[PDB]
Nucleic acid binder design. Sequence first.
RNA 1: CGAAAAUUUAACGGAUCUAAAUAAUAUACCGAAACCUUGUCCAUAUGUAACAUUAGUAAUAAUAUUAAUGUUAUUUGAUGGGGUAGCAGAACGUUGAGUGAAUCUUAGAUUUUUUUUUUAUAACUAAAUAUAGAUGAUAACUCAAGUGAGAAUGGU
RNA 2: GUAUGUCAAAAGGGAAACAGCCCAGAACAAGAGUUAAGGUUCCAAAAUUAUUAUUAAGUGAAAUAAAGAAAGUUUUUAUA
RNA 3: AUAAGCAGCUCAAGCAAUAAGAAAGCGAGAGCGUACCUUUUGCAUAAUGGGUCACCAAGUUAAUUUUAGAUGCGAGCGAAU
Lengths: 133, 138, 98, 62, 183, 63
Amino acid sequence: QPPISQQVKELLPVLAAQPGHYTTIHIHGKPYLVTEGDTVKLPFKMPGVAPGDVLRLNRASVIGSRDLTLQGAPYVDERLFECRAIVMGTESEPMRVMIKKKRRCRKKKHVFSKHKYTVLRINQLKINDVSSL
Amino acid sequence: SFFRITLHRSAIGLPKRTHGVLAALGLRRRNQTVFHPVEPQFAGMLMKVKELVRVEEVPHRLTKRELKDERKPDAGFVVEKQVRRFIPGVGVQDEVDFSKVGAVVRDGKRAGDLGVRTRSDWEVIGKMKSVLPKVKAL
Amino acid sequence: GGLLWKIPWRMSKFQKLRQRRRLRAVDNVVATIENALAKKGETVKAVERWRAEMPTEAEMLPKDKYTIFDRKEKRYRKGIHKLPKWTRVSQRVNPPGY
Amino acid sequence: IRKGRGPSSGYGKTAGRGTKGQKAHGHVKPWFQGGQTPLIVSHGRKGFVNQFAADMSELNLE
Amino acid sequence: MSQTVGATRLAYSRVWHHISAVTPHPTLSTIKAPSEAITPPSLGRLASRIATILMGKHKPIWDPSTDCGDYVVVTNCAGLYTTGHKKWRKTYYRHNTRPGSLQAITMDALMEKHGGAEVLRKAVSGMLPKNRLRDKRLARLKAFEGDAHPYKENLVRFGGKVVGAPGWEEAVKAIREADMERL
Amino acid sequence: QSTANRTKRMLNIPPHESFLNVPVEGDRIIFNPPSSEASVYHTPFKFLPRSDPRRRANIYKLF
RNA sequence: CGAAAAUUUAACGGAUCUAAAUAAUAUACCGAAACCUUGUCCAUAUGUAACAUUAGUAAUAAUAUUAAUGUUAUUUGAUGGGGUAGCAGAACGUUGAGUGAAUCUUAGAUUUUUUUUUUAUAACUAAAUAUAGAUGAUAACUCAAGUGAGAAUGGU
RNA sequence: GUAUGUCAAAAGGGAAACAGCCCAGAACAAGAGUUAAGGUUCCAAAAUUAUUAUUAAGUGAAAUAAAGAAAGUUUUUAUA
RNA sequence: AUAAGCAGCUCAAGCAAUAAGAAAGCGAGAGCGUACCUUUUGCAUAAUGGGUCACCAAGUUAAUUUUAGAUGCGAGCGAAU
Ligand SMILES: [K+]
Ligand SMILES: [K+]
Ligand SMILES: [K+]
Ligand SMILES: [K+]
Ligand SMILES: [Mg+2]
Ligand SMILES: [Mg+2]
Ligand SMILES: [Mg+2]
Ligand SMILES: [Mg+2]
Ligand SMILES: [Mg+2]
Ligand SMILES: [Mg+2]
Ligand SMILES: [Mg+2]
Ligand SMILES: [Mg+2]
Ligand SMILES: [Mg+2]
Ligand SMILES: [Mg+2]
Ligand SMILES: [Mg+2]
Ligand SMILES: [Mg+2]
Ligand SMILES: [Mg+2]
Ligand SMILES: [Mg+2]
Ligand SMILES: [Mg+2]
Ligand SMILES: [Mg+2]
Ligand SMILES: [Mg+2]
Ligand SMILES: [Mg+2]
Ligand SMILES: [Mg+2]
Ligand SMILES: [Mg+2]
Ligand SMILES: [Mg+2]
Ligand SMILES: [Mg+2]
Ligand SMILES: [Mg+2]
């Protein structure tokens, strides 16, 4: 595996030492800025997940603190951080009706939409110690 | 080699003969990529719609399952722990922890076969009045 | 007339830039097709006609990229943005002298 | 098909007749051709029907 | 949602900015060379910068519905910079709905009655959204003819140095260095 | 606007300038002191016990 | 400059602009219900597996399988998606009828409401009000129509 | 009449407002996603982004008023 | 009670439950949107019709002649004995 930069190996301990940390995870390419304890409501029904499953997020573009920010070129290396979530079931929206209609045409075509959304819970967001790497 | 033809523009206001040229190429909707051999019959087909497509010479043809994999984003997550799940076709599938790795699916016609704790299992646990934690653990 | 078709007589520097890039993009489609065939020792009659009597964007005069020939005009010239579907149609050569 | 029971049925309002004309207001005679003379009046009827011929019941050897 | 969970007090506070219509502005001037030719910000180029402040669009929390604008004190409006012959050839028109009652006045004749501050309020007014916040935002533009104004104590300061003063930048860098002495 | 998506674009605000200088061919850490009021959990160095090794020169002095 | 018209600046959309004008160029960004990505709905296919019903065929005293219909999942990571006149298919609802001498109802049937949930022209959960044992209500399938109204200077 | 297209029966972006023009064909949502026409000082999403000249008339800047006149100005080509 | 909305839709401050728990509703402010039908090449049109609400109100039946699907019999079918 490509070795981590020396400049990243000297400032990561300073980044992990600060009180709070945030990350921008990427689910299917879409970003979500989250913190440990947040509740992400994805705009789609994740297939093949039941309430209680534990996920391991591995695509994080930015892991930063107040003053320090770790930015990977395509993404941050998975070895530096550790993020995990837990599926809290799925939620739904109130049925919204769209009425497609034209002027001087009595026909009103209806479209009924009711989508489901998977709810996550970021239960772990920690920066690893890279002294060995 | 092959021609990588991608429909950049539409033909909503162009003559009907221009629609037959895009149909022979296979371009139905916008930003659709089709692969065709480098031959005069296809080269002359592109000179009629050279204001609507983008041509590129490629060594090999890309399959249908390979043209879509270059726009597929990384999932960004890995299911590391699953819970006890009932699959209608197969049966109950016990919880598995992929971090320590086991999809065992037990099917049957009795509760004991499924691998779950039944009322009988709860009565043998209630009759074990002698079991006790070790003093050091306590 | 009373129906207002508010079409300016001249183009803007933005329309002229995209017209330059649309002419230069059709030059790459004809060069790619002509180079891919040359490797196979083949030629198309339509590709040989184009390269013969049609210029490239770098060989065109500024007045040939933004204007066309209309005989009903004072100076026999008309903005190219007045041509139907001018954005998706090829137009680079005008009568000689005009 | 119940004609005239809303737009979404597909046979509402005009009820398959379109807008106006004889074929919506009233009825066109079946034999009418717009005014052009029919081919039976331009060529005439050919032959006669034999009312005295016998109606045999054909029977074969097979 | 964490990014916006916190104290928003100071993000919605009204800051009292200051600018002089006579001081050369290297950014809002069209003559960028030589150093001696840099002109002040023209009427419309100063008004476009002020309309952005009155809307609060310079903030990262801007919302068109919320009135997160700030105050702007414009001084030295008598020497308002203008190009060409606008001062004597630009006309302002007014109508009261009664035919015949069209009132016209040149920029120089409008600066003799209400000074150059009125010419600036008309420019900034037309650059603001035409809605129910246009009069509140335009009221936070306090334009004066000379250097005197009643807001010399309201102007935002950093370490006792008013912004735009000779040594305000150095006073700001000195306060942020001490801020880094913490976890 | 007509739809919620169109309202999101008209009300857009870009991220900070520092988050736009994305690196290339590797990962890096940049000093990004925000223009905001710090909380009370960022204890000043004067209030830290002598034993606490977290006491250290300013992050600016590490770059 | 030529260049004059009658409500008001009066065809820069406006503010305003000496470029934020004009001409010859270059790059970045924004930009639609277009396209892409992740999900969902509907339509039409192609195979497979499972669940249920109905009707057969075998096995069983020491359950398996066949066919049709309905349904969910899944394979090809299937294809397709504006619409007038008009054509076609599939369903819901209303009134009455058969199964019905059936089923349920003071342990609350029914109550023009409100409320809740479900891909939802419909039904459902609960609440409130009142008090019926059948001249009450009703699932499912089926039969027949005086069967669905913001539009006729319509009628009461 | 002819050729082609749109509207008619086509919503959406641009043309200030717009049946017919320039783009583009709306099954439903999500995204600082990617683009077309068109645009990027403010109203109003995006450049007060770069290079070289011209204009001083607000000419002009998204609907070119003409012939014509003239020590307005710039450049080129001759020429003293 | 500083304002020029076919009264809806998009974003949304705030108010709203004496109390553990529990926010339907109303909504300041910002933006988008010129009713419906009929008839027309084309209507926000200053073209047609309607004061509102409830009810009545329009491809049905008969005979005759056909087609499709399903199904009974089959060189016979149907009817009737
Ligand atoms: K018909
Ligand atoms: K009730
Ligand atoms: K009327
Ligand atoms: K009826
Ligand atoms: Mg007109
Ligand atoms: Mg129809
Ligand atoms: Mg018919
Ligand atoms: Mg009619
Ligand atoms: Mg007719
Ligand atoms: Mg004007
Ligand atoms: Mg689409
Ligand atoms: Mg479509
Ligand atoms: Mg009526
Ligand atoms: Mg009446
Ligand atoms: Mg069409
Ligand atoms: Mg018509
Ligand atoms: Mg349209
Ligand atoms: Mg404009
Ligand atoms: Mg963007
Ligand atoms: Mg802006
Ligand atoms: Mg002008
Ligand atoms: Mg008020
Ligand atoms: Mg309005
Ligand atoms: Mg007419
Ligand atoms: Mg009317
Ligand atoms: Mg009735
Ligand atoms: Mg049929």
